[PDB]
């Protein structure tokens, strides 16, 4: 089966270059087309590119014509997309795709299609600088339905760049909890919240803690979130 | 350049039925070269059905492609659970590929209302300067809702940003958050501060709201 492993997620500012390399394992290298396929965050999917190895071929998307370049190096089985000029639009997961095939080696058929994909790779462009987020509670309402439901969470505010992962009592919380999509504001900076709904009874005497992890600033913080004393 | 365009652009149906998606281009593509692909979030796309008709050994034989020269169409004769994600075509007869913009199909169920929640900005946050208050939206169907933030009585617009979870795997609903940021100055200059909800499971507009300092 063929593997496609991309490089690390990747983090830049406006007006430069980057370069994501797609490492081709398995199957062959040089006679099925290894395309690049971009998605910004909560859009579609977006044909950059593609390349026939062995044929030194590229095809390029107009939208990208100048700026992109894509390269297949068959002595190390991978193919690279630098994409240069970078502006905050072109902030997406960049995934490599290569055609499948009927059978294998160079004497495989090509379908064209893209059946194999690597995990993807996060660019994401920006003039902020790496920033690990506040964690402000949102605290259980003191007007909270006694016998009933109560809502409470965490504000994980002012970060970047993406991904932030949040938990509950370090795992131990899984029903109700909503860890909404993050906004980006207009300062540049992350922002998302991670709500849980619970029973009001629980509201004096369970302790709810949320986990918050962001590895891109390398900052892990774990918030307490308590009624207001009023 | 040719252009696909999928629809509808959200399908709703339930649990077995049978889901038949449109891709529809704008000029012939040649020798059937059209592609589906699922997508699930978090997860790279999925090829599902290749040459408008053949389908990659390891994908379920309910999924069926059909059609030709500007009109194709994807089917699922019965739909899975795990059948309930995004669907992308694609056109590659030219050098210069193309997808489509996507369908996303999702679970029908029984209208739901949003249990309404509102939260002051923290102590923690003031001492900082600005004040965030976020107004929880949990747990309703179908996705579409609006929410109206009034401080004062008076109807805001541009301080304010909304974010939709997924639809969940276990109760098909859906979740809103919307977050109303002032600077700590702006946020002191007034008392009341309120969300309206509307939705199709609600008959009334909801408004859950809060004085500042109580
Ligand atoms: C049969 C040989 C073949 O298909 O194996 C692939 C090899 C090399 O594999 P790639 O580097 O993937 O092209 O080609 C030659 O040996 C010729």
């Known amino acids: 089966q063929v593997q496609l492993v991309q490089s690390g997620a990747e983090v830049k500012r406006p007006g430069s270059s980057v370069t994501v390399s797609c490492k081709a394992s398995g199957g062959s290298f040089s006679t099925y087309a290894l395309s690049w396929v971009r998605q910004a965050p909560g859009r579609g999917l977006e044909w950059m590119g593609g390349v026939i190895p062995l044929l030194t071929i590229t095809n390029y998307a107009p939208r990208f014509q100048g700026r992109i370049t894509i390269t297949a190096d068959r002595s190390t089985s991978t193919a690279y997309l630098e994409l240069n000029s970078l502006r905050p639009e072109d902030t997406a997961v960049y995934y490599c795709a290569r055609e499948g095939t009927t059978g294998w080696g160079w004497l495989g058929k090509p379908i064209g299609a893209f059946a194999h994909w690597g995990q993807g790779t996060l660019v994401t462009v920006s003039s902020a600088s790496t920033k690990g987020p506040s964690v402000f509670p949102l605290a259980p309402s003191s007007k909270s339905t006694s016998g009933g439901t109560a809502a409470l969470g965490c504000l994980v505010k002012d970060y970047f760049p993406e991904p932030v992962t949040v938990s509950w009592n370090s795992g131990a919380l899984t029903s109700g909890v909503h860890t909404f999509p993050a906004v980006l504001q207009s300062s540049g900076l992350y922002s998302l919240s991670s709500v849980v709904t619970v029973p009001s009874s629980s509201l004096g005497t369970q302790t709810y803690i949320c986990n918050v992890n962001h590895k891109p600033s390398n900052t892990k913080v774990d918030k307490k979130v308590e009624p207001k004393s009023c | 350049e040719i252009v696909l365009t999928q629809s509808p652009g959200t399908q709703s149906l339930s649990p077995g039925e049978r889901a038949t998606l449109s891709c529809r281009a704008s000029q012939s593509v040649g020798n059937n070269k059209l592609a589906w692909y699922q997508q699930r979030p978090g997860q790279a796309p999925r090829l599902l059905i290749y040459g408008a008709s053949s389908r990659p050994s390891g994908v379920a034989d309910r999924f069926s492609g059909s059609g030709s020269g500007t009109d194709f169409t994807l089917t699922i004769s019965r739909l899975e659970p795990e059948d309930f994600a995004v669907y992308y075509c694609?056109?590659?007869?030219?050098?210069?590929?193309?997808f489509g913009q996507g369908t996303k199909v999702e679970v029908k169920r029984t209208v739901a209302a949003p249990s309404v929640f509102i939260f002051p900005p923290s102590d923690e946050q003031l001492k900082s300067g600005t004040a965030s208050v976020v107004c929880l939206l949990n747990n309703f169907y179908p996705r579409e809702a609006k929410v109206q933030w009034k401080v004062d009585n008076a109807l805001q617009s541009g301080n304010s940003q909304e974010s939709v979870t997924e639809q969940d795997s276990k109760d098909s609903t859906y979740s809103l958050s919307s977050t109303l940021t002032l600077s700590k100055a702006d946020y002191e200059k007034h008392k009341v501060y309120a969300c309206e909800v509307t939705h199709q499971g609600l008959s009334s507009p909801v408004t859950k709201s809060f004085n500042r300092g109580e």
């Open positions: 694609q056109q590659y007869g030219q050098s210069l590929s193309t």
